[PDB]
Coordinates of C-alpha atoms and ligand atoms in Angstrom, one line a residue:
Chain R
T729 CA 3.5 -75.6 -24.5
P730 CA 6.8 -77.4 -24.1
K731 CA 6.9 -79.6 -21.0
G732 CA 8.0 -77.8 -17.8
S733 CA 8.0 -74.4 -19.5
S734 CA 7.1 -71.2 -17.7
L735 CA 4.3 -70.2 -20.0
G736 CA 2.1 -73.2 -19.6
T737 CA 0.1 -72.4 -16.5
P738 CA -0.4 -68.7 -17.1
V739 CA -1.6 -69.2 -20.6
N740 CA -3.8 -72.0 -19.2
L741 CA -5.4 -69.5 -16.8
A742 CA -5.7 -67.0 -19.7
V743 CA -7.7 -69.6 -21.7
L744 CA -9.9 -70.1 -18.6
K745 CA -10.7 -66.3 -18.3
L746 CA -11.3 -66.1 -22.1
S747 CA -13.8 -69.0 -21.9
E748 CA -15.5 -67.5 -18.9
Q749 CA -16.0 -63.9 -20.1
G750 CA -17.2 -65.0 -23.5
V751 CA -14.2 -64.0 -25.6
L752 CA -13.7 -67.5 -27.1
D753 CA -17.4 -67.8 -27.9
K754 CA -17.6 -64.3 -29.5
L755 CA -14.5 -65.0 -31.5
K756 CA -16.0 -68.3 -32.6
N757 CA -19.2 -66.6 -33.7
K758 CA -17.1 -64.1 -35.6
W759 CA -14.9 -66.4 -37.6
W760 CA -17.4 -69.2 -38.4
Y761 CA -21.0 -67.9 -39.0
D762 CA -20.5 -64.2 -39.2
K763 CA -17.8 -64.3 -41.9
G764 CA -20.1 -67.0 -43.4
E765 CA -20.6 -67.1 -47.2
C766 CA -24.2 -68.5 -47.1
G767 CA -27.3 -67.7 -45.1
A768 CA -28.0 -69.1 -41.6
Chain V
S2 CA 44.1 -29.1 23.7
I3 CA 42.5 -32.5 22.9
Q4 CA 44.3 -34.9 20.6
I5 CA 41.9 -36.4 18.1
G6 CA 42.5 -38.5 15.1
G7 CA 40.7 -38.5 11.8
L8 CA 40.4 -40.6 8.6
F9 CA 39.2 -39.2 5.3
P10 CA 38.6 -40.6 1.8
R11 CA 40.9 -39.0 -0.7
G12 CA 38.0 -38.3 -3.0
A13 CA 35.5 -36.5 -0.7
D14 CA 36.5 -32.9 -0.1
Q15 CA 33.3 -31.1 1.2
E16 CA 33.3 -33.3 4.3
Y17 CA 36.7 -31.9 5.3
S18 CA 35.6 -28.4 4.7
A19 CA 32.5 -29.0 6.8
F20 CA 34.8 -30.5 9.4
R21 CA 37.0 -27.4 9.5
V22 CA 33.9 -25.2 9.7
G23 CA 32.9 -27.3 12.7
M24 CA 36.3 -26.7 14.2
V25 CA 36.1 -23.0 13.9
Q26 CA 32.4 -22.7 15.0
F27 CA 32.5 -25.1 18.0
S28 CA 36.0 -24.0 19.3
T29 CA 35.8 -22.4 22.7
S30 CA 37.9 -20.4 25.2
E31 CA 38.8 -23.2 27.6
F32 CA 39.8 -25.9 25.1
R33 CA 40.3 -26.4 21.3
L34 CA 40.2 -29.8 19.6
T35 CA 43.4 -30.6 17.7
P36 CA 42.8 -32.9 14.7
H37 CA 45.4 -35.1 13.1
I38 CA 44.0 -35.8 9.6
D39 CA 44.9 -38.7 7.3
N40 CA 43.8 -38.7 3.7
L41 CA 43.7 -42.3 2.3
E42 CA 41.8 -44.7 0.1
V43 CA 39.0 -45.8 2.4
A44 CA 38.2 -49.2 1.0
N45 CA 41.7 -50.5 1.7
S46 CA 41.9 -52.5 4.9
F47 CA 45.7 -52.1 5.1
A48 CA 45.5 -48.4 4.8
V49 CA 42.8 -48.2 7.5
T50 CA 44.8 -50.4 9.8
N51 CA 48.0 -48.3 9.4
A52 CA 46.1 -45.0 9.7
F53 CA 44.3 -46.2 12.9
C54 CA 47.6 -47.5 14.3
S55 CA 49.4 -44.2 13.6
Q56 CA 46.6 -42.2 15.2
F57 CA 46.7 -44.6 18.2
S58 CA 50.5 -44.4 18.6
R59 CA 50.1 -40.6 19.0
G60 CA 47.5 -41.5 21.7
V61 CA 44.5 -39.6 20.3
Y62 CA 41.5 -39.7 22.6
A63 CA 38.9 -40.3 19.8
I64 CA 38.8 -40.8 16.1
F65 CA 36.4 -39.3 13.5
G66 CA 36.4 -41.2 10.3
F67 CA 34.7 -42.7 7.2
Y68 CA 34.7 -46.4 6.4
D69 CA 33.6 -48.6 3.5
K70 CA 32.0 -52.1 3.5
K71 CA 35.5 -53.5 2.8
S72 CA 37.1 -51.5 5.6
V73 CA 34.4 -51.7 8.3
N74 CA 35.3 -54.8 10.3
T75 CA 38.9 -53.7 10.8
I76 CA 37.5 -50.5 12.4
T77 CA 34.8 -52.2 14.6
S78 CA 37.2 -54.8 15.8
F79 CA 40.1 -52.4 16.5
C80 CA 37.9 -49.8 18.2
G81 CA 36.1 -52.5 20.2
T82 CA 39.3 -54.1 21.4
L83 CA 41.5 -51.1 22.1
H84 CA 38.6 -49.1 23.6
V85 CA 39.0 -46.1 21.2
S86 CA 35.8 -44.1 20.3
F87 CA 35.0 -44.0 16.6
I88 CA 32.6 -41.3 15.2
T89 CA 31.4 -41.8 11.7
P90 CA 29.0 -40.5 9.0
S91 CA 29.2 -43.9 7.3
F92 CA 26.4 -46.4 7.1
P93 CA 25.6 -47.8 10.5
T94 CA 26.6 -51.4 11.2
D95 CA 23.8 -53.8 12.0
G96 CA 24.7 -55.2 15.4
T97 CA 26.2 -54.6 18.8
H98 CA 29.4 -53.0 17.7
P99 CA 31.0 -51.1 20.7
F100 CA 33.1 -47.9 20.7
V101 CA 31.5 -46.7 17.5
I102 CA 29.3 -43.6 17.4
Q103 CA 27.3 -43.7 14.2
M104 CA 26.1 -40.2 13.2
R105 CA 23.8 -41.5 10.5
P106 CA 20.1 -42.3 11.3
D107 CA 18.6 -45.6 10.2
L108 CA 17.0 -45.4 6.7
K109 CA 15.2 -48.8 6.6
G110 CA 12.0 -47.8 8.5
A111 CA 11.3 -44.7 6.4
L112 CA 11.9 -46.7 3.2
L113 CA 9.6 -49.6 4.1
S114 CA 6.9 -47.2 5.5
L115 CA 7.1 -45.2 2.3
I116 CA 6.7 -48.4 0.2
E117 CA 3.6 -49.0 2.2
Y118 CA 2.4 -45.4 1.8
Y119 CA 2.3 -45.7 -2.0
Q120 CA 0.8 -49.1 -1.7
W121 CA 3.3 -50.6 -4.1
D122 CA 2.8 -54.2 -4.9
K123 CA 5.6 -55.1 -7.4
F124 CA 8.7 -52.9 -7.6
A125 CA 12.4 -53.0 -8.7
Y126 CA 15.2 -52.5 -6.2
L127 CA 18.7 -51.5 -7.4
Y128 CA 21.3 -52.1 -4.7
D129 CA 25.0 -51.0 -4.6
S130 CA 27.3 -53.6 -3.1
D131 CA 29.6 -51.1 -1.5
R132 CA 27.1 -49.1 0.6
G133 CA 26.1 -52.4 2.3
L134 CA 23.4 -55.0 1.6
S135 CA 21.5 -54.5 4.9
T136 CA 18.6 -52.7 3.3
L137 CA 18.3 -55.3 0.6
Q138 CA 17.8 -57.9 3.3
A139 CA 15.3 -55.5 4.8
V140 CA 13.1 -55.1 1.7
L141 CA 13.3 -58.8 0.9
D142 CA 12.5 -59.9 4.5
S143 CA 9.5 -57.5 4.5
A144 CA 8.5 -58.6 1.0
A145 CA 8.2 -62.1 2.4
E146 CA 5.5 -61.0 4.8
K147 CA 3.9 -58.4 2.5
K148 CA 3.3 -60.6 -0.6
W149 CA 5.4 -58.1 -2.6
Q150 CA 6.9 -59.2 -5.9
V151 CA 10.4 -57.7 -5.8
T152 CA 13.1 -57.8 -8.5
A153 CA 16.4 -57.1 -6.9
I154 CA 19.3 -56.3 -9.2
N155 CA 23.0 -55.7 -8.2
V156 CA 24.2 -52.5 -9.9
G157 CA 27.6 -52.4 -8.2
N158 CA 29.8 -54.6 -10.5
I159 CA 30.1 -52.1 -13.3
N160 CA 33.5 -51.3 -15.0
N161 CA 34.8 -47.8 -15.7
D162 CA 35.0 -48.8 -19.4
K163 CA 31.4 -50.1 -19.7
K164 CA 28.9 -47.8 -18.0
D165 CA 26.0 -46.8 -20.2
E166 CA 25.9 -50.2 -21.8
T167 CA 25.1 -52.1 -18.6
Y168 CA 22.4 -49.6 -17.5
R169 CA 20.9 -49.6 -21.0
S170 CA 20.8 -53.4 -21.0
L171 CA 19.3 -53.5 -17.5
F172 CA 16.6 -51.0 -18.2
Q173 CA 16.0 -52.7 -21.6
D174 CA 15.3 -55.9 -19.5
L175 CA 13.1 -53.9 -17.2
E176 CA 11.3 -52.5 -20.2
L177 CA 10.6 -56.0 -21.4
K178 CA 9.1 -56.7 -18.0
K179 CA 7.5 -53.3 -18.3
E180 CA 7.9 -52.4 -14.6
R181 CA 7.1 -48.8 -13.9
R182 CA 8.4 -48.6 -10.3
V183 CA 12.1 -48.3 -9.4
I184 CA 13.8 -48.1 -6.0
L185 CA 17.4 -46.8 -6.0
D186 CA 19.6 -47.5 -2.9
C187 CA 22.9 -46.1 -4.0
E188 CA 25.6 -43.5 -3.4
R189 CA 24.8 -40.1 -4.9
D190 CA 27.3 -40.3 -7.8
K191 CA 25.9 -43.6 -9.0
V192 CA 22.5 -42.2 -8.4
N193 CA 23.2 -39.3 -10.8
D194 CA 24.9 -41.6 -13.4
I195 CA 22.0 -44.0 -13.4
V196 CA 19.6 -41.0 -13.6
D197 CA 21.5 -39.7 -16.7
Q198 CA 21.2 -43.1 -18.2
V199 CA 17.5 -43.2 -17.5
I200 CA 17.0 -39.8 -19.1
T201 CA 18.9 -41.1 -22.1
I202 CA 16.6 -44.2 -22.3
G203 CA 13.7 -41.8 -21.6
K204 CA 12.2 -43.7 -18.8
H205 CA 11.5 -40.5 -16.8
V206 CA 8.3 -40.1 -18.7
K207 CA 4.9 -40.1 -17.0
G208 CA 3.7 -43.4 -15.7
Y209 CA 7.0 -44.2 -13.9
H210 CA 7.7 -43.8 -10.2
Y211 CA 11.2 -43.5 -8.6
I212 CA 12.3 -43.6 -5.0
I213 CA 15.7 -42.4 -4.3
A214 CA 16.6 -43.8 -0.9
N215 CA 19.3 -41.9 0.9
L216 CA 19.5 -38.7 2.9
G217 CA 21.0 -36.9 -0.1
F218 CA 17.8 -36.2 -1.9
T219 CA 18.7 -32.6 -2.7
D220 CA 22.4 -33.5 -3.0
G221 CA 21.8 -35.3 -6.3
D222 CA 20.5 -33.2 -9.2
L223 CA 16.7 -33.3 -9.5
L224 CA 16.6 -30.5 -12.0
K225 CA 17.1 -32.6 -15.2
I226 CA 14.4 -35.1 -14.1
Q227 CA 12.1 -32.3 -12.8
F228 CA 10.3 -31.4 -16.0
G229 CA 10.1 -35.1 -16.9
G230 CA 6.9 -35.8 -15.0
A231 CA 7.7 -39.2 -13.4
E232 CA 7.0 -38.9 -9.7
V233 CA 10.2 -39.0 -7.6
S234 CA 10.2 -39.5 -3.8
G235 CA 13.2 -39.2 -1.5
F236 CA 14.3 -38.6 2.1
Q237 CA 15.7 -35.3 3.3
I238 CA 17.8 -35.3 6.5
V239 CA 18.3 -31.5 6.5
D240 CA 15.3 -29.2 6.7
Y241 CA 16.2 -25.8 5.2
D242 CA 13.4 -23.9 6.9
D243 CA 15.0 -24.4 10.4
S244 CA 16.9 -21.4 11.7
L245 CA 20.1 -23.3 12.6
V246 CA 20.2 -24.8 9.1
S247 CA 19.6 -21.4 7.5
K248 CA 22.5 -19.9 9.5
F249 CA 24.7 -22.7 8.4
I250 CA 23.5 -21.9 4.9
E251 CA 24.6 -18.3 5.1
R252 CA 27.9 -19.2 6.5
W253 CA 28.5 -22.0 4.0
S254 CA 27.5 -19.9 1.0
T255 CA 29.7 -17.0 2.3
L256 CA 32.9 -19.0 2.2
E257 CA 35.5 -18.5 -0.6
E258 CA 35.4 -21.6 -2.8
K259 CA 39.2 -21.8 -3.0
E260 CA 39.9 -22.0 0.8
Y261 CA 37.1 -24.5 1.5
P262 CA 36.6 -26.8 -1.5
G263 CA 33.0 -26.9 -2.7
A264 CA 31.7 -24.7 0.1
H265 CA 30.1 -21.9 -2.0
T266 CA 27.0 -24.1 -2.6
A267 CA 23.7 -23.0 -1.2
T268 CA 23.0 -26.6 -0.4
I269 CA 25.3 -28.9 1.6
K270 CA 25.7 -32.7 1.2
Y271 CA 24.4 -34.7 4.1
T272 CA 27.6 -36.6 4.8
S273 CA 29.4 -33.2 5.3
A274 CA 26.5 -32.1 7.5
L275 CA 26.9 -35.2 9.7
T276 CA 30.6 -34.5 9.8
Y277 CA 30.0 -30.9 11.1
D278 CA 27.4 -32.2 13.6
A279 CA 30.0 -34.8 14.7
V280 CA 32.5 -32.1 15.5
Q281 CA 29.8 -30.5 17.6
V282 CA 29.0 -33.8 19.3
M283 CA 32.7 -34.4 20.2
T284 CA 33.1 -30.9 21.5
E285 CA 30.0 -31.2 23.7
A286 CA 31.2 -34.6 24.8
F287 CA 34.4 -33.3 26.1
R288 CA 32.6 -30.4 27.7
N289 CA 30.4 -32.9 29.4
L290 CA 33.4 -34.8 30.6
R291 CA 34.8 -31.5 31.9
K292 CA 31.6 -30.7 33.9
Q293 CA 31.8 -34.2 35.6
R294 CA 35.3 -33.2 36.7
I295 CA 36.7 -36.4 35.1
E296 CA 40.4 -36.3 34.1
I297 CA 40.6 -36.5 30.3
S298 CA 44.4 -37.0 30.5
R299 CA 46.2 -40.3 30.0
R300 CA 49.2 -40.8 32.4
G301 CA 51.2 -42.5 29.6
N302 CA 51.4 -43.3 25.9
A303 CA 49.1 -46.0 24.7
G304 CA 51.9 -47.4 22.7
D305 CA 51.6 -50.0 19.9
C306 CA 48.1 -51.0 18.8
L307 CA 49.3 -54.5 17.9
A308 CA 51.1 -55.1 21.2
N309 CA 50.2 -58.5 22.6
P310 CA 48.3 -59.2 24.7
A311 CA 46.3 -56.1 23.7
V312 CA 46.4 -53.2 26.1
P313 CA 43.0 -51.4 26.3
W314 CA 43.3 -47.9 27.6
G315 CA 41.0 -47.0 30.5
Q316 CA 39.8 -43.5 29.9
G317 CA 38.4 -44.4 26.5
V318 CA 35.4 -46.0 28.2
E319 CA 34.5 -42.8 29.9
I320 CA 35.0 -41.0 26.6
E321 CA 32.7 -43.4 24.8
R322 CA 30.0 -43.0 27.5
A323 CA 30.4 -39.2 27.2
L324 CA 29.9 -39.3 23.4
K325 CA 26.9 -41.6 23.7
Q326 CA 25.1 -39.5 26.4
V327 CA 25.4 -36.4 24.2
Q328 CA 22.1 -34.9 23.1
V329 CA 22.4 -31.9 20.9
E330 CA 20.7 -29.7 18.2
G331 CA 22.3 -29.8 14.8
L332 CA 21.9 -29.8 11.0
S333 CA 20.4 -33.3 11.2
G334 CA 17.8 -32.3 13.7
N335 CA 17.6 -33.8 17.2
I336 CA 20.8 -35.7 18.0
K337 CA 20.7 -38.6 20.5
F338 CA 22.3 -42.0 20.8
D339 CA 21.4 -45.4 22.3
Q340 CA 24.1 -47.8 23.7
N341 CA 25.0 -49.3 20.3
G342 CA 25.9 -45.9 18.9
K343 CA 22.8 -45.6 16.7
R344 CA 20.8 -42.4 16.4
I345 CA 17.4 -42.2 18.0
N346 CA 14.6 -39.7 18.3
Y347 CA 15.6 -38.7 14.8
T348 CA 13.1 -37.4 12.2
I349 CA 13.3 -37.6 8.4
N350 CA 11.5 -35.4 5.9
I351 CA 9.6 -37.4 3.2
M352 CA 9.9 -35.4 0.0
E353 CA 8.2 -35.6 -3.4
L354 CA 9.6 -34.0 -6.5
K355 CA 7.2 -31.5 -8.0
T356 CA 7.2 -29.1 -10.9
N357 CA 8.1 -26.1 -8.8
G358 CA 10.7 -28.0 -6.9
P359 CA 11.4 -30.3 -4.0
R360 CA 8.7 -30.2 -1.3
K361 CA 8.0 -31.8 2.0
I362 CA 5.0 -34.1 1.8
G363 CA 5.5 -35.7 5.2
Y364 CA 7.9 -36.8 8.0
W365 CA 9.0 -40.0 9.7
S366 CA 9.9 -40.8 13.2
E367 CA 10.8 -44.3 14.7
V368 CA 7.9 -44.0 17.1
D369 CA 5.6 -42.1 14.7
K370 CA 6.1 -44.0 11.4
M371 CA 4.8 -42.3 8.3
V372 CA 3.1 -38.9 8.9
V373 CA 1.4 -36.8 6.2
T374 CA 1.3 -33.0 6.5
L375 CA -1.6 -31.6 4.5
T376 CA -0.4 -29.4 1.6
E384 CA -8.1 -25.0 -12.8
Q385 CA -10.5 -26.3 -15.5
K386 CA -14.1 -25.2 -15.5
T387 CA -16.8 -27.9 -15.2
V388 CA -20.1 -27.7 -17.1
Chain I
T50 CA 45.7 -58.8 12.0
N51 CA 47.6 -59.9 15.1
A52 CA 48.1 -63.5 14.0
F53 CA 48.9 -62.7 10.4
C54 CA 51.4 -60.1 11.3
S55 CA 52.9 -62.5 13.9
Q56 CA 53.4 -65.0 11.0
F57 CA 54.9 -62.2 8.9
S58 CA 57.4 -61.5 11.6
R59 CA 58.4 -65.2 11.7
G60 CA 59.1 -64.9 8.0
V61 CA 56.7 -67.5 6.6
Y62 CA 56.8 -68.0 2.8
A63 CA 53.1 -68.8 2.7
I64 CA 50.1 -69.1 5.0
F65 CA 47.3 -71.7 5.2
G66 CA 44.2 -70.4 7.0
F67 CA 40.4 -69.8 7.2
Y68 CA 38.4 -66.6 7.1
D69 CA 34.9 -65.3 7.7
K70 CA 32.6 -62.6 6.2
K71 CA 34.1 -60.2 8.7
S72 CA 37.8 -61.0 8.4
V73 CA 38.2 -61.8 4.7
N74 CA 39.1 -58.3 3.5
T75 CA 41.9 -58.1 6.1
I76 CA 43.5 -61.2 4.6
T77 CA 42.9 -60.1 1.0
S78 CA 44.3 -56.6 1.6
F79 CA 47.3 -57.6 3.7
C80 CA 48.3 -60.5 1.4
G81 CA 47.9 -58.1 -1.5
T82 CA 50.2 -55.5 0.1
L83 CA 52.8 -57.8 1.6
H84 CA 52.8 -60.1 -1.4
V85 CA 52.4 -63.2 0.8
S86 CA 50.3 -66.1 -0.4
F87 CA 47.1 -67.3 1.4
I88 CA 45.7 -70.8 1.0
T89 CA 42.2 -71.4 2.2
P90 CA 39.4 -74.0 2.3
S91 CA 36.9 -71.2 2.9
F92 CA 34.5 -69.5 0.5
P93 CA 36.0 -67.9 -2.6
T94 CA 36.3 -64.1 -2.7
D95 CA 33.8 -61.9 -4.6
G96 CA 36.7 -60.5 -6.7
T97 CA 40.1 -60.8 -8.3
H98 CA 42.2 -60.3 -5.1
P99 CA 45.9 -61.3 -5.5
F100 CA 48.0 -63.7 -3.4
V101 CA 44.9 -65.7 -2.5
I102 CA 44.5 -69.3 -3.6
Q103 CA 41.1 -70.8 -3.1
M104 CA 41.0 -74.5 -2.6
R105 CA 37.3 -74.3 -2.9
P106 CA 35.5 -74.2 -6.3
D107 CA 32.7 -71.6 -6.9
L108 CA 29.3 -73.2 -6.6
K109 CA 27.1 -70.7 -8.4
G110 CA 26.9 -72.0 -11.9
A111 CA 26.3 -75.6 -10.7
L112 CA 23.4 -74.4 -8.5
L113 CA 21.8 -72.4 -11.3
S114 CA 22.1 -75.3 -13.7
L115 CA 20.4 -77.5 -11.1
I116 CA 17.5 -75.0 -10.6
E117 CA 17.1 -74.8 -14.3
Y118 CA 17.3 -78.6 -14.5
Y119 CA 14.3 -79.2 -12.2
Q120 CA 12.5 -76.6 -14.2
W121 CA 11.6 -74.5 -11.1
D122 CA 9.4 -71.5 -11.8
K123 CA 8.7 -70.1 -8.4
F124 CA 10.6 -71.3 -5.3
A125 CA 11.9 -70.3 -1.8
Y126 CA 15.4 -69.4 -0.9
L127 CA 16.9 -69.3 2.6
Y128 CA 20.3 -67.6 3.0
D129 CA 22.6 -67.5 6.0
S130 CA 23.6 -63.8 6.4
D131 CA 26.7 -64.9 8.3
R132 CA 28.3 -67.0 5.5
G133 CA 27.8 -64.5 2.6
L134 CA 25.4 -62.9 0.2
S135 CA 27.3 -63.8 -3.0
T136 CA 25.2 -66.7 -4.2
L137 CA 22.0 -64.8 -3.1
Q138 CA 23.0 -61.9 -5.4
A139 CA 23.7 -64.4 -8.1
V140 CA 20.3 -66.3 -7.9
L141 CA 18.4 -62.9 -7.7
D142 CA 20.2 -61.4 -10.8
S143 CA 19.7 -64.7 -12.7
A144 CA 16.1 -64.8 -11.5
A145 CA 15.6 -61.3 -13.0
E146 CA 17.0 -62.8 -16.2
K147 CA 15.2 -66.1 -16.1
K148 CA 11.8 -64.9 -15.0
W149 CA 11.9 -66.7 -11.6
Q150 CA 9.8 -65.8 -8.6
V151 CA 12.2 -66.0 -5.7
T152 CA 11.3 -65.7 -2.0
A153 CA 14.5 -64.6 -0.2
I154 CA 14.6 -64.9 3.6
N155 CA 17.4 -63.8 5.9
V156 CA 17.6 -66.5 8.6
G157 CA 20.6 -64.8 10.3
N158 CA 18.4 -62.0 11.7
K179 CA 5.1 -70.1 0.8
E180 CA 6.2 -72.3 -2.0
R181 CA 6.9 -76.1 -1.6
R182 CA 10.4 -75.8 -3.1
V183 CA 13.1 -74.6 -0.7
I184 CA 16.7 -73.9 -1.4
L185 CA 19.0 -74.0 1.7
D186 CA 22.2 -72.0 1.5
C187 CA 23.6 -72.6 5.0
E188 CA 26.3 -74.3 7.0
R189 CA 25.4 -78.0 7.7
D190 CA 24.5 -77.1 11.3
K191 CA 21.6 -74.8 10.5
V192 CA 20.0 -77.2 8.0
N193 CA 19.1 -79.6 10.8
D194 CA 17.4 -76.9 12.8
Chain B
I195 CA 16.6 -27.0 -27.7
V196 CA 17.6 -30.6 -28.1
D197 CA 18.5 -30.6 -24.4
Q198 CA 15.0 -29.4 -23.7
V199 CA 13.6 -32.2 -26.0
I200 CA 15.4 -34.8 -23.9
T201 CA 14.1 -33.2 -20.7
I202 CA 10.5 -33.4 -21.9
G203 CA 11.0 -37.0 -23.1
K204 CA 9.9 -36.3 -26.6
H205 CA 12.8 -38.4 -27.9
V206 CA 10.8 -41.6 -27.5
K207 CA 9.8 -43.7 -30.4
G208 CA 7.2 -42.3 -32.8
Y209 CA 9.1 -39.0 -32.8
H210 CA 11.3 -37.7 -35.6
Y211 CA 13.8 -34.8 -35.5
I212 CA 15.6 -33.1 -38.4
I213 CA 18.6 -30.9 -37.7
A214 CA 19.1 -28.4 -40.5
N215 CA 22.7 -27.2 -40.1
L216 CA 26.0 -27.6 -41.9
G217 CA 27.1 -29.5 -38.8
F218 CA 25.6 -32.7 -37.5
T219 CA 28.3 -34.7 -35.6
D220 CA 29.3 -31.2 -34.5
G221 CA 26.5 -31.2 -31.9
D222 CA 26.0 -34.1 -29.5
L223 CA 24.4 -37.1 -31.1
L224 CA 25.1 -39.4 -28.2
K225 CA 22.7 -38.3 -25.5
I226 CA 19.8 -38.4 -28.0
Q227 CA 21.1 -41.6 -29.6
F228 CA 19.6 -44.2 -27.2
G229 CA 16.3 -42.2 -27.1
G230 CA 14.5 -44.4 -29.7
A231 CA 13.5 -41.4 -31.9
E232 CA 14.9 -41.1 -35.4
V233 CA 17.1 -38.1 -36.1
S234 CA 18.4 -36.9 -39.4
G235 CA 20.8 -34.0 -40.3
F236 CA 23.5 -33.2 -42.8
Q237 CA 27.3 -32.7 -42.4
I238 CA 29.5 -30.6 -44.8
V239 CA 32.8 -32.0 -43.4
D240 CA 33.4 -35.6 -44.3
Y241 CA 36.0 -37.2 -42.0
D242 CA 36.5 -39.9 -44.6
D243 CA 38.5 -37.7 -47.0
Ligands
NAG801 C1 13.4 -36.8 21.9 O1 13.2 -35.8 20.9 C2 12.6 -34.6 21.5 C3 12.4 -33.6 20.4 O2 11.6 -34.1 19.4 C4 13.5 -34.1 22.7 O3 12.8 -33.0 23.3 C5 13.8 -35.2 23.7 O4 14.7 -34.8 24.7 C6 14.3 -36.4 23.0 N1 14.5 -37.5 24.0 C7 15.7 -37.9 24.3 C8 16.9 -37.2 23.7 O5 15.9 -38.8 25.2

């Protein structure tokens, strides 16, 4: 975010929540391995 | 044969009609109040000064009038200094102001208590500059203690030329913030205009909550926003179930529209009601002064209001005391005054807008706060 | 009213004076009607009122620029109800515009950043 | 009927109304204009002529 902007801290907390409730991890698993072209 | 002065806004007729009805109704065998009426633009300080001076040169014993935020201090200062009693429907001044009898009950407590009743956290507050900013200060001060997030927007700067555009812009901005709760502290005309604009922007749909804060809840038209579904709450000063009110309703509805302007209505605006009740209060005040065997007469003419050093007239004190001690039954319910001229013991009907029509969900008293009065698909 | 009319009787061509939240409309309306000019150090009127010359500049834009300059998101605002609500109305409307969280307190009867709109006397208290 | 439409708040976006009449600007387009819904109708009288 641009320095001193209003969005920085709330999007920060949003990122916190998303990491805690497993959204980031699930999304990660979705885009990397699950959409994967070969095996496991 | 009591000389009384009066000051009316050139734009509001029904108040004068209600005043005349009060004159006819409360007139008695022994004495009859003689009004001297001046129609003038209320917001003008000069006009108010000259009106008051003309009324004072005739030596009227008391003055019934309306004032505006721009005209109020001239009135409070003049009446305070020259010892003339002022009786008004207008918004009560916040303070110690002497020689003013304010017919209107205080709306702040009911408003705040209602905000607490719905458990609102974040809401919007639209304030009109002309009706006074006291309640703005109220909801902000209380928002400081209550953790409330409040967006306060001044709606009173709008031009005659640009009306719909400003409201559309404002509600577009409130649509961006997606705030579903709106509080309107405004005069009834502006209330209805803003309402029309809301209806046009279609924000009266379900999921929205509106609070119209004034005693004019049924004065403004709730019919167009009735089928809308967005819950609307307001404050009613006049309970139509009460017998006195009903009698006033038959009399009011009976009147020929031509003789008394806007009288034919089945419902009466609250300002006019307060006017009528003010006539009552003045009559009873002078009857009270009569039963104390106090001489109401002034031995000489009061003279110029600007004469220096200012000459206060003596009897006016006794008049003021009389008007303040008055306790009567009227359209507004129990009528009583403290020393400042404010109403006390008053009660306000808390009303919610429902499909069938306006209903009374509760009531509010200064001592009692918010009080609720208790008021299909098969399942497998 | 007394003093101004006293000066009008003396036939002054213009008047230099002060006003307060209570008396300002008297001066504006009377100067407007009598077409006599009023010159004042006091706060600017909220409107276009004629025959009034304000020696004081309006402070609102400067203030907003300053609050925008320190990049204040949420802050606290203390207004003196005796001086006027003009700048308060301003900062609140512009807060609604700029996505500010403003705590407005009437001191005339939690955030670390406090804006004092007051006469110099109250600030010390 | 349009009055009723605006009363029920069906003039919000996602809604589309078609007025079939020789008049269009004849009736009021203004109250339903800011509604957000899309309205279409046909006029026989062209004020351009
Ligand atoms: C308070 O109001 C009640 C009615 O609710 C009335 O009986 C009583 O006299 C009032 N008290 C006053 C006017 O001091």
